[PDB]
Paper text:
[FeFe]-hydrogenases represent one of natures’ most effective classes of redox enzymes catalyzing the reversible reduction of protons to dihydrogen (H2) at turnover frequencies of up to 9000 s-11–3. With their low catalytic over-potential, [FeFe]-hydrogenases represent excellent models for a regenerative and likewise economically feasible H2 production. Their active center (“H-cluster”) can be structured into a standard [4Fe-4S]-cluster ([4Fe]H) and a diiron site ([2Fe]H). Theoretical studies suggest that the most probable PT pathway comprises of strictly conserved residues E282, S319, E279, and C299 (from surface to H-cluster, numbering corresponds to CpI), including two protein-bound water molecules (Wat826, Wat1120 4XDC19, chain B) located between E279 and C29915,16,20. In this study, site-directed mutagenesis (SDM) is used to investigate the PT pathway of two [FeFe]-hydrogenases, namely CpI and HydA1, which represent the largest (M3) and smallest (M1) type of monomeric [FeFe]-hydrogenases, respectively.
Crystallization of HydA1 exclusively succeeded for apo-protein, which carries the [4Fe]H-cluster but lacks the [2Fe]H-site. Variants of HydA1 apo-protein were crystallized in space group P32 2 1, with a single chain in the asymmetric unit. However, comparisons of crystal structures of CpI apo- and holo-protein with apo-HydA1 demonstrated that a lack of cofactor does not affect the configuration of the putative PT pathway. For the corresponding alanine variant of both, HydA1 and CpI, shifts of the conserved water molecule in the putative PT pathway can be observed. While glutamine occupies the entire space of the native carboxyl group and thus clearly interrupts the putative PT pathway, an exchange to alanine may support additional H2O molecules to bridge the gap.
Author numbering: 65 to 155, 161 to 350, 363 to 490
The structure:
Amino acid sequence: LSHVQQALAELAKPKDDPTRKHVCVQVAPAVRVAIAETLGLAPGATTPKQLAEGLRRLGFDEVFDTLFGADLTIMEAGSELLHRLTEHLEAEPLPMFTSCCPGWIAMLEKSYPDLIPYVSSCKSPQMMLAAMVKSYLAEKKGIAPKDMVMVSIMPCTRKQSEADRDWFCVDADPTLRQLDHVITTVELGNIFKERGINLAELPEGEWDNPMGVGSGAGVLFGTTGGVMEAALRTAYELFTGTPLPRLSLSEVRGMDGIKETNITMVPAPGSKFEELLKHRAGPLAWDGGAGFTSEDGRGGITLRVAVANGLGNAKKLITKMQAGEAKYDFVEIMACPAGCVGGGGQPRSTDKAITQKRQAALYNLDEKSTLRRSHENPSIRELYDTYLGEPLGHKAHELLHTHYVAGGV
Ligand code: SF4
Ligand SMILES: [Cl-]
Ligand code: NA
């Protein structure tokens, strides 16, 4: 009856049982780093492939990395940000708010419904991957979507409410969910312990590529800095023709839980963006944007970015934004004070710095030194080229975008 119980019941069916479904799991990075703590070990003390092996030992037919879903979110959100910028340069409002945290989306709908048009229409990484699995991958494997079960392992006690939004379903049948069951880090750790599975003693397993062909997880080596940063990078690099380094946000004096950075953007020589800047020179009192110019006319825009952690802190930021005392163009609100590594589904620790330890072990040092870019991922390129079309296009909109409901759902 619980979602854990339903998922385990699907796995309990022998693989050759005529009523067996194709049971898929996707795993968030915050889960991978914290799951070792369920054994009393340090964050990161078990490897990603040990976790993949453990999941395969529970009976999962596919084991996916949610980072594949995040590459889709980066493609869509980066394009969406650049589109809003483009529309505003040529005279879907700015500022844009990210949409990946369901705690934020719940507060948005209930308490700030007038802000709905400013929020990204992107689904979350877990929902984009789920939508893809029950469309593209089902078709590829010749499996009816109703015979697919999608489970996510999340650090978050709110991701089931996200998955349960009614229209996240296949062909307007609300009982055919894109994402069926969410299991938290601690629930999964309990499942392993109840079965005598010790992740730390497992051999390395393998990931499956959600494209259904090829080796590995379908995500390239390296790190992005997360969906918000990589969406910014996508827009910035197209706008300027120059690389965006890893960001370092600074604390905002006088506002708890708020960090910021300003990103100066000069359009690439000969680009449409350069043309737009030169030729064409609501609830949130947006100031028409920050810009700069030089004596010879090489002008640019300055993108003002904020991240709010904690919903109380976000409410204070929104108050200041409405007052015009805080001026931002792109804002990420996450409900958890420490972000997802400190989510409500994570192990409890006496270590006041456990979330710092989780963040540090979240990706290895070799991968942290390497910046990767979602649009360079051959699996992502193939999916757009042969199935989705263009970011923000009709098919991408259908599978990967969503809407919001004033008053909540
Ligand atoms: S910040 Fe917290 S509530 Fe929001 S997605 Fe992450 S774990 Fe869930
Ligand atoms: Cl997600
Ligand atoms: Na594989």
